[PDB]
Design a protein around this ligand. Structure first.
Ligand code: NA
Ligand code: NA
Lengths: 168, 168
């Protein structure tokens, strides 16, 4: 178990997020840091676009960078949609085997298996989704999930603040 | 070692702080939660009053509640002053034995020994001090310090935000 590491990683990243000059920088910092520190092979952050009923990719490490600001996933659909509707984490060892998973080989991404999807919720309002993936067919351990969930609370506040300032 | 607990406590308190309706409520929540969860016997939060060059007590669990908003300590003085000037944590098993400690028996508080003083710093600017005390003559373990430091980053942001909104 690596809970002590998680704690110090949280310390460093909480520091870096609060020092970030804007929301975009905070999000981009997080996906990179998570992959480096957990470690994990991909990390993506989606923000809700309530008018169009879609999640929009807003930061990624591991995925095609051009998809940032462009990749849209419909509310309620797929595994990521399921995370959003449950408003609970989904932690799996082999995501592609889940009945809700939508396989998109055309996108030319790596073959991930391990999956941790975490709802980003501000006082009961879903604002986005944090998605962590790895090549190994392993779920994420307890301290990893706790770390990511605790982090998502911070991300929710940062997104809410950006929205409240008209920065989105 | 109780790092896994710290991680989940952080999860719950980070949640509660972000859900707090104002700064005062966040601060009061923190001092109570820290004492319950670590556990510790007293926890106090001071905010810098730069005009008068004093730390002002703004929340406490364990100390005389009437001192809140009233107790003032001069910059640079005593152990708490030393935490502020070092901008580093001071973690001791027996605070009263430290050369910088100022004993105030007249205040009628409990005889604490273990001491963790943590600077609350927002992007290099000292905003306050978090002080955790216990009756046992034990310093605070690594996960306890990491927990409290990580928390203080959150507190710094909350104080900075309140100041920026004119709420202080
Ligand atoms: Na959804
Ligand atoms: Na000082």
């Amino acid at each position: 178990s690596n809970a002590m590491n998680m704690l110090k990683i949280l310390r460093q990243i909480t520091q870096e997020v609060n020092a970030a000059p804007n929301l975009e920088q905070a999000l981009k910092l997080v996906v990179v840091r998570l992959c480096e520190a957990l470690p994990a092979d991909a990390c993506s952050l989606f923000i809700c676009d309530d008018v169009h009923g879609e999640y929009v990719l807003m930061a990624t490490q591991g995925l095609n960078s051009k998809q940032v600001g462009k990749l849209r996933l419909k509310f309620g659909e797929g595994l990521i949609g399921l995370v959003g509707e449950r408003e609970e984490p989904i932690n799996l060892a082999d995501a592609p085997l889940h009945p809700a998973y939508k396989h998109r080989p055309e996108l030319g991404e790596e073959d991930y298996h391990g999956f941790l999807g975490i709802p980003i919720i501000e006082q009961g309002e879903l604002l986005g989704i944090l998605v962590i993936q790895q090549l190994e067919s392993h779920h994420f351990a307890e301290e990893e999930e706790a770390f990511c969930v605790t982090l998502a609370i911070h991300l929710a506040a940062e997104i809410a603040h950006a929205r409240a300032k008209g920065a989105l």
